[PDB]
């Protein structure tokens, strides 16, 4: 990585976000803005992917909503996330949990690992 780009983007990196890994369950408090007014919408799901480095790092959270799985991908350091809570620490064996895309119900469970 170039050292210059790290310095330029350093100010905009967020420092309050908790450490989490693929497999953990997160409540992402997303600042939804419909114009003048903004309302925090919570998206709770499993972290299935976390790629990239520095200011360009992103992560993907997956949940089943009304029978349909939904995945949301966010920039890790985006100011549009108000807060992230790690609800649960999951025991997984790989960085990308793509296999969860084909599973549903009991097959899609992630073992907990008390941190």
């Amino acid at each position: 990585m170039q050292k210059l780009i790290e310095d330029i983007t350093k100010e905009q990196l967020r420092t309050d976000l908790p450490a989490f890994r693929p497999g953990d369950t997160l409540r992402v408090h997303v600042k939804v803005v419909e114009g003048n007014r903004e309302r925090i919408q919570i998206f709770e799901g499993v972290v299935i992917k976390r790629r990239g480095g520095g200011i360009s790092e992103t992560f993907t959270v997956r949940k089943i909503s009304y029978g349909v799985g939904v995945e949301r991908t966010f920039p890790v350091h985006t100011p549009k996330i108000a807060k992230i809570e790690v609800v649960r620490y999951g025991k997984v064996r790989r960085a990308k949990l793509y296999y969860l895309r084909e599973l549903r119900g009991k097959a899609a469970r992630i073992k907990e690992i008390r941190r």
């Binding site: 983007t9 905009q12 200011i55 360009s56």
Partner: protein, 207 residues
């Protein structure tokens, strides 16, 4: 018309105040030096000659050193001209710095596109392939060379050949941030050329 020479450092992204995520290209422009002012009287046209990126003495030759002697500066690796500039606002030896631009300003960016070597009609000219199955033996070929009547191929029948490495201008890019301390320009979007390649940032000609 404003302009400055710089090196392409790479791309990253920046969050705007309203939360938008803007991709930016980082251009590093150590202060340029005005090496020569050309005039209509002496040269037939008005232009400013900017030197950029001080070259090691060993790499510079004697003709170069003499040319930059009047500006009282180290030899420069990259020399370019700018036309359309306010001649009176510039003096030989003056340093041109990134702070001539400001955030939000619209600029054109010139560079040499990355080379791709010898490329076929499909890649080089975005032509269509033939069928891949149903007996086809025509896949990545450049198509009929033309009608029979002329007994020759018309000029401009596009064919394989060396691709990339041409001078290319992208117009109407926005300056996102000017880091005077580090001599950086953050320009929204991407610009031609490989990393470390010379980039020219001028005030937009369509403004």
């Amino acid at each position: 018309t404003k302009g400055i020479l710089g090196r392409k450092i790479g791309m990253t992204q920046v969050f705007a105040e309203n939360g938008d995520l803007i991709p930016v290209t980082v251009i590093e422009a150590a202060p340029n030096v005005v090496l020569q002012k050309k005039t209509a009287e002496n040269d037939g046209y008005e232009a400013i000659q900017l030197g950029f990126d001080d070259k090691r003495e060993k790499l510079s030759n004697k003709p170069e050193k003499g040319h930059v002697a009047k500006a009282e500066t180290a030899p420069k690796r990259f020399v370019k001209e700018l036309r359309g500039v306010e001649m009176d606002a510039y003096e030989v030896g003056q340093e041109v710095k990134v702070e001539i631009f400001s955030a939000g300003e619209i600029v054109d960016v010139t560079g040499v596109s990355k080379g791709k070597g010898f490329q076929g009609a499909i890649k080089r000219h975005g032509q269509s392939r033939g069928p891949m199955s149903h007996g086809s033996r025509y896949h990545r070929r450049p198509g009929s060379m033309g009608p029979v009547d002329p007994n020759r191929v018309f000029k401009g029948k596009l064919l394989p050949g060396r691709m990339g490495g041409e001078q290319i201008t992208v117009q109407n890019l926005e300056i996102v941030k000017v880091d005077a301390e580090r001599n950086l320009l953050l320009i929204k979007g991407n610009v031609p050329g490989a990393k470390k390649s010379l980039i020219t940032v001028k005030s937009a000609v369509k403004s």
